[PDB]
Amino acid sequence: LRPREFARLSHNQKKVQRAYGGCLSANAVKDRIVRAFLIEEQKIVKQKLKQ
Amino acid sequence: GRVIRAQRKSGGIFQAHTRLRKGAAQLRTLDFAERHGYIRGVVQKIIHDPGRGAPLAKVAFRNPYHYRTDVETFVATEGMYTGQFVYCGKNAALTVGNVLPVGEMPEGTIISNVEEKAGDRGALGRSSGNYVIIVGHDVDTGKTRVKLPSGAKKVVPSSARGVVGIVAGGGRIDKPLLKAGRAFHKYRVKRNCWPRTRGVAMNPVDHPHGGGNHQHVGHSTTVPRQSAPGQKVGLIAARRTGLLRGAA
Amino acid sequence: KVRTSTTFRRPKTLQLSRKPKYARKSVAHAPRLDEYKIIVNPINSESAMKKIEDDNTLVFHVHLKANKFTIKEAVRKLYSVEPVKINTLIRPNGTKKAFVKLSADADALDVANRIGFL
């Protein structure tokens, strides 16, 4: 649609029922979740091995 | 006579054509993080800049004092890629793309977009394929000696920052343009400086070289350094002329 | 005196409203363009007559500065009828003409006769 036509749709037509729905693709979100988890776990081990 | 072409290049139709340019290529304002530590940024885009040989890199940094992200426009060094992490500051590692004080890098390192004054955000070695070489440090009253692309040796303070690596965009000038039209397109996105009419092709009113019943200059084309505008044409303050056979 | 921003901004101060010692103008002006200025005259050309008897609409010469809001009120106050829509045009002689359509519960022909331009 043209940009202002989006102001007339209902909420769910402008998004997907998922995190970052309507802003990130499904595969991009999946990369973000896995990347966030693995990086956080690495921060945990680096903190554990620092002591 | 009339005002010669060189004297008319003071603005107006001779301004740079800058509509298609996305931003100046600058180092990043020298701040606390870079003075004392490092800060990490991620390469978001590597883009063509109309009128510039080298590509530019848009690099995203976190703002240390506010919840916001600051995008910087760097001259891309060869090897840089989107998604790469770059590190700027005193404690950044000596890796292609990182930004370090020249005093923190050993003699012989190859760098680009080097500051003349600490914090001027990049002056030296910026065009495609160019770089600056670290020659030596003088720790007492810290001054770093560098070699410039022209071959000149320069002394910058050992706090002026530099980017590790050579400016991307390679050996652009190795390719013959081959056609007037290709030169047309190269300068169309730069400024109104092409094509160029020769001075001797003109009339005396137009140029000191103009006139005569053959196309010739008349007097010497090596003119003094202190010539007035309108007579400062040809080979200005030339130390020598002619085809050099072995130089340094 | 803690400043958490590196930017000095002008502090907010009282800013009193005007309390004049004298009214600059002694007498307020009466309403300019009330209703006798807005409606100048009925228009009774042949085309206007057809508008009256076919589309239930009246044609008026009105003030150049009248709009569709004030023309509606003026017609209601002067002739006690309720326009449903008003269309406006500025004629090539520079004067403004209004097409005032009346509701289906009023007859434009009767209103025209009552005004007296028929």
Partner: protein, 229 residues
């Protein structure tokens, strides 16, 4: 209770958004504030000629309180007090003698720069109090030399504004005591002796010493570091 867990923030370089600290030192101030601050600095550098440097040497707190205690006793009459005196003179000027018969000689501090200068030149000032912050300083820069020449005790005291309060004005460049009631003669003499030991006795040697000339801040610490090594 178990849900209340500490969540520390590091605040090192590149870790957490810095907390809201005091940035007053690095604020870009409006021009008038900048001017009045760098003006105080420039007066600290820029070695000060002795006739200007003798100011900024003011009376101590204790002597200043005694002086103002005496001055506050001899305040000039206010407009209300003056109006009351005039109605008394008017009532007594109808059936009795002149206004002298019903009003007494006034005892009050003298003020007004031209008036006080004349009193000093005529040797009628017993004590002269010179404000310390007269902004065009030339108005009073000669007063210590004039007082010393005429042998009248003088003190440089803080706040032209404090002097002005005594005489019911916003500010006063200088005040003079000409006469004091008998009950205050000993206090004036003690103040005069205290003032003289600090100022009149100083004047001979104060004419040579220069003010300012001091750098401070970072440059002095560098000198201190230079000395320590």
């Amino acid at each position: 209770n178990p849900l209340f867990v500490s969540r520390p923030r590091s605040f090192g370089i590149g870790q957490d958004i810095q907390p809201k600290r005091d940035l007053s030192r690095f604020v870009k101030w409006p021009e008038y504030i900048r001017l009045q601050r760098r003006r105080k600095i420039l007066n600290l550098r820029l070695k000060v000629p002795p006739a200007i440097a003798q100011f900024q040497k003011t009376l101590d707190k204790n002597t200043a309180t005694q002086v103002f205690k005496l001055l506050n006793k001899y305040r000039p009459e206010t407009a209300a007090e003056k109006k009351q005196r005039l109605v008394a003179e008017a009532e007594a000027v109808a059936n009795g003698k002149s206004a002298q018969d019903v009003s007494k000689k006034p005892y009050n501090v003298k003020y007004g720069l031209n008036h006080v200068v004349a009193l000093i030149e005529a040797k009628k000032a017993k004590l002269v109090l010179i404000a310390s912050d007269v902004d065009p300083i030339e108005l009073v820069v000669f007063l210590p030399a004039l007082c010393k020449k005429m042998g009248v005790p003088y003190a440089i005291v803080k706040n032209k504004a404090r002097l002005g309060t005594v005489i019911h004005q916003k500010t006063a460049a200088v005040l003079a005591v000409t006469e004091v009631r008998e009950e205050d003669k000993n206090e004036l003499a003690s103040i005069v002796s205290a003032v003289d030991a600090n100022f009149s006795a100083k004047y001979d040697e104060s004419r040579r010493k220069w003010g300012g000339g001091i750098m401070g801040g970072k440059t002095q610490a560098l000198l201190a570091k230079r000395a320590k090594a």
